[PDB]
Amino acid sequence: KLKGRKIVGGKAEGEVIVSRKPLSFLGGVDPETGIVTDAESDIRGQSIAGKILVFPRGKGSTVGSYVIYALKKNNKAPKAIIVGEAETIVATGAIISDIPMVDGVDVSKLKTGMKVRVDADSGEVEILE
Amino acid sequence: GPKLKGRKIVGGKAEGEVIVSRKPLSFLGGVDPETGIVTDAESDIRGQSIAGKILVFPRGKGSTVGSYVIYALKKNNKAPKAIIVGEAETIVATGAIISDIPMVDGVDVSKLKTGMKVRVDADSGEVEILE
Amino acid sequence: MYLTKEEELILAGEYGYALQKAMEILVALGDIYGADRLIPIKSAQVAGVSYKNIGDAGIEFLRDFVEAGAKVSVYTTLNPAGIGDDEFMEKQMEVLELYRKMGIEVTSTCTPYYGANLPKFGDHIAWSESSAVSFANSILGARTNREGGPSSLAAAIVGKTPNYGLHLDENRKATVIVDVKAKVKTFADYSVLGYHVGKTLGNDVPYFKNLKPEKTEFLKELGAAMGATGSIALYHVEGETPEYREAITDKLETITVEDSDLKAVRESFQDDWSDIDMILIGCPHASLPEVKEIAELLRMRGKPLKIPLFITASRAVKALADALGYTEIIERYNGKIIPDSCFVVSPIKGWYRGIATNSGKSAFYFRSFGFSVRLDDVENLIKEAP
Amino acid sequence: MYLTKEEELILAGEYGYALQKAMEILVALGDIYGADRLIPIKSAQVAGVSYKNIGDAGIEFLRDFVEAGAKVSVYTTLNPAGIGDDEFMEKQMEVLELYRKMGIEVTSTCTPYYGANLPKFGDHIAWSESSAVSFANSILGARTNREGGPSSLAAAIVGKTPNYGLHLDENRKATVIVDVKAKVKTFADYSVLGYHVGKTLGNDVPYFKNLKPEKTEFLKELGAAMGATGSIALYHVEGETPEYREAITDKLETITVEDSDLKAVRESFQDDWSDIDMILIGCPHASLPEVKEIAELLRMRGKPLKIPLFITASRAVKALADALGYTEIIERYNGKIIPDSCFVVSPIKGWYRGIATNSGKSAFYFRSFGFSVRLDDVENLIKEAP
Ligand code: F3S
Ligand code: F3S
């Protein structure tokens, strides 16, 4: 069990997909598909839809929060977001899209493919082995 | 003889007969620019002219445009021949400059009364009292 | 007052009768207030625009000066114009043309700090009308004397003023401390307070404690009112004015303004609605939020006004309220935004006999001229109006 | 972050999904920067207005918020719009219209301080455009952070901001001194200087010594550039900034800007005239005397421009240029004044290929978009123009 902060509540379980690079939503993620578009992200072609996203911090344009909202309408949104440090772009996106977010977690202890449960109301991540 | 010393505001020399007022004369609506007749609600002087007279008064008052009334006064020849103010403010000195009306301030106006003949050397700020 | 060698050429007519006389006035002023030198001004506002003020005498000088070849050497704007019959108006436009021929921006407003000419903190300028001078000095921290009509014109042609008065750090220091115990929160309350503080003070630079205005416009009013009843060209509001920390530099007396002081002025301008045939809002010239305020107020009234409503405002503000649909709303109900004009300076004694207004300045002047006046906030005025 | 009992009800959801989710945003930024409480704001400025930058995901959010009843509780204006073919404009008008339904002044300018919305010294506001933020903090003394698109809106809805950063006294103290040893006289100089200081400085609050700008527009540009090559949200100029006296409170380091520093930037923006098919002035949106300058310059040129000139301006300024006759002098020589639009934020990629400008901000963004650019002063751009 890894402990973090309650950014946005809710509970979710899914497949962990990890980025070790600052991820920028305006440009680097497609609102229609959920596929990463960033030229040099780890997951150049992987889609976020219905997964558990892990990445150190968001970056890029303040507008990126709106992309995350389009992902949630277009139903290609992640089930939950695990950031190293919660910032304005990603948190606002989860707040307006009702996506559960928990930051301050050791994101290095999460590798791609892990089955994982996030209780975002209390801000805790549990790895299922 | 009894020369009264003051400050140069506008040069030039002018002799002639006096008119004196111990009240702040206002020049916007206080002088009819056609006649030089003093028309002010409050004044020592109401219905008296200024043309060709030495105008002794304590200070100008009222609105800053009064300078133009003096400029119109002069170009109508109904302006005073000179101006002996006690204290030079910006209404009457400005009007004297654009009108080329000889002006002097700092004079003790209590030693001047209406009717006294006088010459004003404004180049030197002097006021002889011709008798 | 020390004059440069170039300035002492201009004084000797080397650059024309127009510059000579301009310089001649500026040295007469320096010699009266003991200014050390002439400082350059970054902009200028010229007074003496309405034909009711300067009259035919004003046109005479203005005319000869333009013929002599007078041209402004710095960016200068104008003071508001008049409104009257077309016989009058034809004469007024002659005034505005002469100023134009001198190179002046014909923007004819007392709020040029909206789009036209916004001075920077510490800029030395030559502004001429009371509400603007108080605003630039107090709420912007720029520096300018309360220049007159001719003094500002000369300063605008040379490009310099005498370095006396409010141009000097020591003259911007607070003179009195004003403790406002009375309830002062609406626009009209700052109108009525500015009235009272100007009338009871002299040539002071007040320092306002306990004053926290919601809208900056309240201080725009506050200064204007104080500039009418009194002679305040600079104040400080603790926490709100940019110069307030350095304002006090010795022991000062504290005067206090109680609710009794203000009621006595609110109640002096309460003539019946049946003696009121006009509403003036926009003294000083309304901001865009002031107009947007009046717009949304009439939308909730539903019906038009039976007396005319006038919003005097800068050209810049009008053209905003136009493009934003605000003046379209204001005109459907019986209202009109009058651009770059002023009513207290217009010969309207035979057009309207009673003004209702939220301005303390107009309330003061119109009452003295002989009009019925009625002083209240726009929200109250628009509701109660016929 | 402390919440008043009213604020926790907005978060509890008493006042609708709109204020709740807006409050939810705010309490998440406060919990990021450690704001003590929420402080009210006097105005706002919402970023994210161009369809180029917010796209369809933009009109997505704004559609659903307009649906759930979001209105702004404090006077607020907009970032500039874009320019493109009629598809882009329809979507652009949709964006503007959606904001209008939220009760926003659709002014769409980065210079609201001209006419539209002029903050008073010390006013806490919630502004978002970088160039406009640099103006409010440095040149007016008002206090705001560099807000984002969604946060400027979220604050505009509730009427409050997290109390952190540039709202607090101690974060307005300078962090570095800039000894400007180079020759910095002209608009382009302050352009090219800001490009430098902005690029070499971090999140600093620079203090400028030896900097005497003639035109406030020079500091408008000096701030716009630093906000484009860096993140300078607030700077002080010695003797010219309203907060400059209390700026330096501890030992600061002094970087100096030599001429070689400014020269290197000039020569990275020297593309041939044969690579340019557009002139852009007004970035940030031109002031009135900026438009005046360009007109008087096309005067002396006396022949039209064979590549088109664009002056991007607030509608406030554009209106005065109309009424004062400056626009007619401009459109006669192939110029055009574009109200409330912005070019670095329009999909111009296919239309033009080279931008000559006097703005350091425009040069930097157009160069990094792939366009050829040529940076000089307006007088040179217009003399040598085709
Ligand atoms: S000039 Fe303006 S400030 Fe009031 S008295 Fe006239 S509307
Ligand atoms: S948004 Fe405005 S400040 Fe300049 S870069 Fe664009 S014209």
Numbering used by the authors:
A (entry chain D): 2 to 130
B (entry chain B): 0 to 130
C (entry chain A), D (entry chain C): 1 to 386
Question: What did the study's authors say about this model?
Answer:
Therefore, to elucidate the catalytic mechanism at the atomic level, we performed a crystallographic analysis of AcnXType-IIb from TkAcnX; the small and large subunits (TkAcnXS and TkAcnXL) showed sequence identities of 43% and 37% with those of ApAcnX, respectively. The crystal structure of TkAcnX in the apo-form was elucidated at 3.4 Å by molecular replacement using the coordinate set for the structure of AtAcnX in the apo-form; recombinant ApAcnX was also originally prepared, but not crystallized. The crystallographic asymmetric unit contained four TkAcnX molecules consisting of four chains of TkAcnXS (chains B, D, F, and H) and four chains of TkAcnXL (chains A, C, E, and G), the conformations of which (except for the chain B) were very similar; r.m.s.d. values on the Cα atoms were 0.36–0.42 and 0.29–0.37 Å, respectively. As expected from the primary structure, each TkAcnXS (residues 1–130) and TkAcnXL subunit (residues 1–386) superimposed well on residues 1–144 and 157–558 of AtAcnX, with r.m.s.d. values of 1.3 Å over 122 Cα atoms and 1.6 Å over 372 Cα atoms, respectively. Small differences in folding were only observed in TkAcnXS; the N-terminal region formed an additional β-strand (β1), by which the β-barrel was created by nine β-strands, and a shorter loop was connected between β9 and β10 instead of α3 in AtAcnX. On the other hand, the heterodimeric structure of TkAcnX showed a more “opened” conformation than that of AtAcnX. The electron density map and anomalous difference Fourier map suggested that TkAcnX has a cuboidal [3Fe-4S] cluster. Fe1, Fe3, and Fe4 atoms were ligated to the protein by Cys110(L), Cys342(L), and Cys283(L), respectively (the letters in parentheses indicate the location in the subunit). On the other hand, among the [Fe-S] cluster-binding sites, only Cys110(L) (yellow-green) and Cys342(L) (green) were homologous to Cys273 and Cys508 in AtAcnX, respectively, whereas Cys283(L) (aqua) corresponded to Cys358 in mAcn. Although the crystal structure(s) of TkAcnX elucidated in the present study corresponded to the inactive form, in hypothetically activated TkAcnX, the Fe2 atom in the [4Fe-4S] cluster may interact with a water molecule, Glu129(L), and Lys361(L) as well as AtAcnX.
